[PDB]
Design a protein around this nucleic acid. Structure first.
Ligand SMILES: [Mg+2]
Length: 604
DNA sequence: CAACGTCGTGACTGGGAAAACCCTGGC
DNA sequence: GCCAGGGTTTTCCCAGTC
DNA sequence: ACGACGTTG
């Protein structure tokens, strides 16, 4: 770490000299810093650059600390750097460049030449290799501990903002960060040049997805606090009466959200044997035992409704309206990308993905999500997309014929297992079939099937054998992928994304079974996520090309929620059909079920 | 070396509450 | 030196996608 | 209900 070899820039002439160094550099680190972690407001503080290793410069344009001399106006710096920033040819590297692009766009400047981002480099090298933030990269490829903001800030309360810190140590911090990013890129990129499939995935899918994520985050989502506030009162009422009834049944007052007290009082009153134990080892009060014991006593069922209602109230109606952005009135998520081993995206801050559906109050909270005036919600969805993936990859003639006809075998198997007629199967039974069938594809044991559907374990075994008799090509494909994981030491997706499994070697056996099932799991879900990502890329490309009133707000796993004006509905629906159907070259069509409604629940 | 008792027995996520424990500050 | 409180960690348990 | 692994005879 060639520290203290950098420079802090306080004059515009040295800024001209620095950019005259920059424009001819092939790649150069670039990062910006701000006081707050919320990108939406995020008033800017400063920026840094670095051309060659050991050399970096910081320009403080906004600080408030006592006696700040000759800090360059942010306007002049932005005007001078705009030709470099808006240039497409210029190639840049950095950390969390989505944040940087968002901050720049807050001032009306769109960064174009996003060449490489270190976190994506590390993620595409090896998904399961620890954390992918800056500290882990520094530790595992530079072996040099770096100065963190905690060192110059407070412990847990008095974390003074980056604007009110002195220029010297702040500039050294920023220059060191930019430099470490630079050597990380220079070390990591040639190593990625070695492999082919990961290189193609990195060049095609991952990187161009930063601007679309930034724009989607900047769009925001609209919600009404009023409906949530109203629903909260009925939640509180219902929980009050159910709690009163439960405590009159027990004759004692205890917290029904406290698992310890619940299990103690239950197992000391009923005196019945505990059927299942916690993974750490203890009496447990999970769902399935509760539905099992509800037939005998009213306390199990009433605490079941209590658990559901309390979870709903304490999570959704108490987090969603509180986190609304003040100046815009629209909720903003995070959408971190390099977090999952498989490759799918994951919402972080408010987690607008696990919105309850099955419960009537769940579809009510779904109804709560509404659109602004003259705008209608449009949903574009794949159906059984990974089933089409699996049929394409295994070339099983049964699945090929079923998808050629378009049969809802996903629902037909539910009708068979539950005994329901094909026409009377409901949504929850469809979800249960989803779980059962797809676990059966993923090696889900017959004991798990007996637990899920309450059917005898013998029936679970026999019907698993039957299901694999229908599709023997599927079984031999899992066997082939197991052999591939054993030999290669990893599993690769169709487009080239990889998952390294260090547990494929013999280790107590049981651990390998999880590693084995993950080896089967990785390709299918990875390809589904990659198809979703490329569909988003093409859709947003058309968005930027045409610039109509359509906006994109939300991404749910196998779902793309839109925002269109009420006047134009069918045209954008056909456009989405054309782009989303033709995004991926696959044997069977990627059938899409478009939907339009007033609010989110109306769409689906 | 064999038999029996115990430990699992789809994947991928975030997060809430409760509780426990440990570290540090104050008297 | 000791106790209490707060912060951090650990356990159950539950809400989604397939 | 059944297989895997550790412990004990
Ligand atoms: Mg971010």
């Amino acid at each position: 770490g060639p520290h203290d070899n950098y420079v802090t820039i306080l004059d515009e002439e040295t800024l001209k000299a620095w950019i005259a160094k920059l424009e001819k550099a092939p790649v150069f680190a670039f990062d910006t810093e701000t006081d707050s972690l919320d990108n939406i407001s995020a008033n800017l503080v400063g920026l840094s650059f670095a051309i060659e290793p050991g050399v970096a410069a910081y320009i403080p344009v906004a600080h408030d600390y006592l006696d700040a001399p000759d800090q360059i106006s942010r306007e002049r710096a932005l005007e001078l750097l705009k030709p470099l920033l808006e240039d497409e040819k210029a190639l840049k590297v950095g950390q969390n460049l989505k944040y940087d692009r968002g901050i720049l766009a807050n001032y009306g400047i769109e960064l174009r030449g996003i060449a490489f981002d270190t976190m994506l480099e590390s993620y595409i090298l090896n998904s399961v290799a620890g954390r992918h933030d800056m500290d882990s990269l520094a530790e595992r490829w530079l072996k040099h501990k770096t100065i963190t903001f905690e060192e110059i800030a407070g412990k847990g309360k008095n974390q003074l903002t980056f604007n009110q810190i002195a220029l010297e140590e702040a500039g050294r911090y920023a220059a060191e960060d930019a430099d470490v990013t630079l050597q990380l890129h220079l070390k990591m990129w040639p190593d990625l040049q070695k492999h082919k499939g990961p290189l193609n995935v990195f060049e095609n899918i991952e990187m161009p997805l930063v601007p679309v994520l930034s724009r989607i985050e900047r769009n925001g989502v609209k919600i009404d606090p009023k409906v949530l506030h109203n629903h909260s009162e009925e939640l509180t009422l219902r929980l009050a009466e159910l709690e009163k009834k439960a405590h009159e049944i027990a004759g004692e007052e205890f917290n029904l959200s406290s698992t310890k007290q619940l299990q103690t009082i239950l197992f000391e009153k009923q005196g019945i044997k505990p059927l299942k134990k916690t993974p750490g080892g203890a009496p447990s009060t999970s769902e399935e035992v509760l539905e099992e014991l509800a037939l005998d006593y009213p306390l199990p069922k009433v605490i079941l409704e209590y658990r559901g209602l309390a979870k709903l109230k304490s999570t959704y109606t108490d987090k969603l309206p509180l986190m609304i952005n003040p100046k815009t009135g629209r909720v903003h998520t995070s959408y971190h990308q390099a977090v999952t081993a498989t490759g799918r995206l994951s919402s972080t801050d408010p987690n607008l993905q696990n919105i309850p559906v099955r419960n009537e109050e769940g579809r009510r909270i779904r109804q709560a999500f509404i659109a602004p005036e003259d705008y209608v919600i449009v949903s574009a969805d794949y159906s059984q997309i990974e089933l089409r993936i699996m049929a394409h990859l295994s070339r099983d003639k049964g699945l090929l014929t079923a998808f050629a006809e378009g049969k809802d075998i996903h629902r037909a198997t539910a009708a068979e297992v539950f005994g329901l007629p094909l026409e009377t199967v409901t949504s929850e039974q469809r979800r249960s079939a989803k779980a059962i069938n797809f676990g059966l594809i993923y090696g889900m044991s017959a004991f798990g099937l007996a637990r899920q559907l309450n059917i005898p374990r013998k029936e679970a075994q026999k019907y698993m054998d039957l299901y694999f008799e229908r599709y023997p090509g599927v079984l031999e494909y899992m066997e082939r992928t197991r052999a591939q994981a054993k030999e290669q030491g990893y599993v690769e997706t169709l487009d080239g994304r990889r998952l390294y499994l260090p547990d494929i070697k013999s280790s107590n056996g049981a651990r390998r079974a999880a590693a084995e099932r993950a080896a089967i799991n990785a390709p299918m879900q990875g390809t589904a996520a990659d198809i979703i990502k490329r569909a988003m890329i093409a859709v947003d490309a058309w968005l930027q090309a045409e610039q109509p009133r359509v906006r994109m707000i939300m991404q749910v796993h196998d779902e793309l929620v839109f925002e269109v004006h009420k006047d134009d509905v069918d045209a954008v629906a056909k456009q989405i059909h054309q782009l989303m159907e033709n995004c991926t070259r696959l044997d069977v069509p990627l059938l899409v079920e478009v939907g339009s409604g007033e609010n989110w629940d109306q769409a689906h």
